[PDB]
Every structure is written in C-alpha cells, then in structure tokens.
C-alpha cells in the first residue's frame, strides 16, 4: 500500500453527501464517494449536528480508509456558550457564557481554551 493522497475535510455529522467537497476531493483519486458518504454517516450518526474533521487516506487502486476526529475547539466553546445562527432581532442581545480533556490530544491545557473563549469574547463564570 502506497499512499497517493491524504484528504482533510470537515463535514457535518451524519450529513455527508457526494456533493463538494466530498465528490471532487475523493473523486480526484477515484475513491468510492458513495462508500465514504455511507461509512462516514454511519460512523457519525450519534454526534448531533457537530462539525467532524475527517482524514481520508487513498491508495493507488482507489481503496481508502478514513479517521474522524473530535469537533474543533472553537465549535465546542461556541455551542456550550449558546452561540447560534438565525434569531438576531432589533434591541437587546445577550453575550455568551472538559472541552480541554476532549481536545487535549496532558494536564491544564484549558489555558488557551478559557483564553480562546475570551478572545471570542465569551464570559466564563468560575
């Protein structure tokens, strides 16, 4: 097995389709797009609407394997803090207010996790 490509995508959990980026990214190397879509969606079925980073390794005969990762740190901070699209209405709007352990791959790395939140700028309680 000799690697011909390593394709890095981020896709919506349970929601891959053969449309771009999946289609062109896998298609360039002849990988089975439909097989990827199906396995990806099966593997991320219990994940809600999370962003799932996914790495596809493609071989010279078009076979491939993939690894999924943990959602991006910025996504987790935002979701836990109530930040969502849609209902931006005139008048008052409220700012927002562990993930270190889910995102660590040793110890208190939550220093640029609490810090990223404030750069965001989400208020932390404790």
């Amino acid at each position: 097995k000799k690697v011909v490509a390593v394709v890095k995508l981020q896709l919506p959990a349970g929601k891959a389709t053969p449309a771009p980026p999946v289609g062109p990214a896998l298609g360039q190397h002849g990988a089975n797009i439909m097989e990827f879509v199906k396995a990806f969606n099966a593997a991320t079925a219990n994940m809600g609407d999370a962003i799932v980073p996914v790495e596809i390794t493609i071989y010279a005969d078009r076979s491939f394997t993939f690894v999924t990762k943990t959602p991006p740190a910025s996504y987790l901070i935002r979701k836990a803090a109530g930040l969502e699209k849609g209902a931006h209405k005139p008048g008052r709007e409220k700012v927002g207010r562990e993930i270190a352990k889910q995102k660590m791959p040793l110890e208190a790395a939550a220093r640029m996790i609490a810090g990223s939140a404030r750069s965001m700028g989400v208020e932390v309680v404790g």
Binding site: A19, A39, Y75, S116
Partner: protein
C-alpha cells in the same frame, strides 16, 4: 455552487471554521495552503477569503463512468453495478476500504500468475488478503483458499466480497504463523512488499509442500534483488518473472 477560498490550513484557521458553517458552508476541504468552504450561494463574511463560483457536477455519475472493469486474463474484476458480456471469469469486488479492488498492477500480476500455476484442488495461501480478491480468484480456479491478514478491518470486507462471488474461502486474522496449522499449502500467493518477502523466505519454504509454488509480488523493480537473494538462500527454484509498470512478480518452486 460557490467556494470561499481562505489562505491557511484547517489548523491555522480553527477559530473561523464554525463561522463558515453558521454562514451556510456544507463542508470544508484543505488544499495546498488553502481551505475551500463550499456554499450553495455567496454570503457576506468577515473572514477576508475570496468567493469563486465552481461548476456543478454529478460526482456519483463521473465516478461510475470513469471506473471500468479491470481485465486480468482470465479474469475480469467488476464492481457490483458493472455488467459484462465477455467470457472472462468474473470477480466481483466492491471498490471500498480494502486494498485489492483489482485496479492495482500488482493485484493483476498476481491474478494472472494464479491462472498459470494453480492446479484444480490445490490448497492456496493468500498472504495479505485485503479485499479477498486473490483467495476468491483461487476458489474460482478450483483451489481451496485460506486468506490471512494482520489488519482485522479487512476481513469482514473480504467475507462480504466472497458472498458476491458465491465462494467461501477461509478468512483469518494474523500472518504466516497463524496460517501454518492449515497447511502445508500447494500454492502461496503474496502481494506484499520486497522487504517482507526477504524476511519470510525461510518460513515460506516451510509453508509449502515439495513442488509447491510461491507467487510473490508487491515488489518494486529495484527491490527485486532482495527477494531473489532471499528466495535463493531459502532453497527455492525460480519459475518465471513477470513485470508491469515499476512492479514485478516473482515465481518460485519449492
């Protein structure tokens, strides 16, 4: 469809990726020094990327049309949706997550060598079975096949491919040592790589009956001496060499 092109990797751009999705991105693709975000329609974004309209393909159709049956006489290696009219022995292999779709020169080398060397009824070790392709082909040629692989992920795939062909090779997790009790074999086929052939040569000899054949491929042309030196030292007789591209197959008699 539209793409929003941003300088940087996914790592570098981590803080802005949720915003791309909240803006309507359907997925992200890291390319050479860029992230491509795909949207149905352009939106006003604060990220300083660039909007470009891309042409909309039916990617499933493009992929099906460029994926052709793989001829390796006497076999044709077909995807499940393929139709075929010729007289070739069909081998149905799902192009999936296991090496041995039939689209490698080495897989094809090994398929043709099987037809040259495999006697009906003979016992066959497919070392490094992957998709199961070679063990299935061996069954089609009248052999009884054991396909082994150290990668447990491929074995359910090899099993499911065997069902697409109405055959049941024995499939097993492990390597040459785990196959030994099922032998000795009449025929060994091994699409691996040069260095592993050189290391396993003396154990190849023990795996085979007298007059048994080893068909070895996955060998880069320039790495072939390692295998020649090793198979000589293990006491094998050379039967033939076959080449395709930068690859060789080397055939030996015990």
């Amino acid at each position: 469809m539209w793409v929003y092109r941003l300088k940087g990797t996914l790592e570098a751009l981590d803080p802005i990726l949720p915003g791309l999705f909240d803006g309507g991105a359907r997925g992200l693709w890291e390319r050479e020094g860029e992230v491509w975000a795909f949207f149905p329609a352009p939106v006003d974004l604060p990220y300083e990327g660039v909007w470009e309209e891309v042409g909309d393909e039916d990617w499933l159709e493009a992929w099906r049309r460029d994926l052709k049956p793989a001829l390796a006489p006497p076999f044709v290696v077909l995807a499940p949706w393929h139709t075929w009219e010729g007289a070739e022995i069909p081998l149905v292999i799902e192009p999936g997550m296991a090496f041995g779709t039939g689209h490698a020169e080495t897989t094809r080398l090994a398929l043709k060598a099987l037809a040259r060397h495999l006697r009906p009824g003979d016992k066959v070790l497919d070392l490094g079975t992957g998709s199961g392709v070679l063990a299935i082909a061996a069954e089609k040629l009248g052999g009884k096949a054991l396909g082994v692989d150290i990668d447990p992920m491929v074995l359910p795939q090899a099993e499911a491919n065997a069902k697409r062909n109405g055959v049941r090779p024995r499939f097993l997790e492990g390597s040459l040592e785990a196959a030994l009790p099922f032998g000795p074999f009449d025929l060994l086929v091994a699409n691996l790589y040069a260095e592993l052939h050189a290391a396993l040569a003396p154990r190849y000899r023990e795996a085979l009956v007298p007059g048994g054949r080893a068909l070895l491929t996955g060998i880069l042309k320039d790495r072939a001496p390692l295998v020649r030196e090793a198979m000589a030292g293990a006491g094998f007789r050379p039967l033939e060499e076959a080449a395709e591209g930068e690859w060789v197959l080397l055939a030996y008699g015990r």
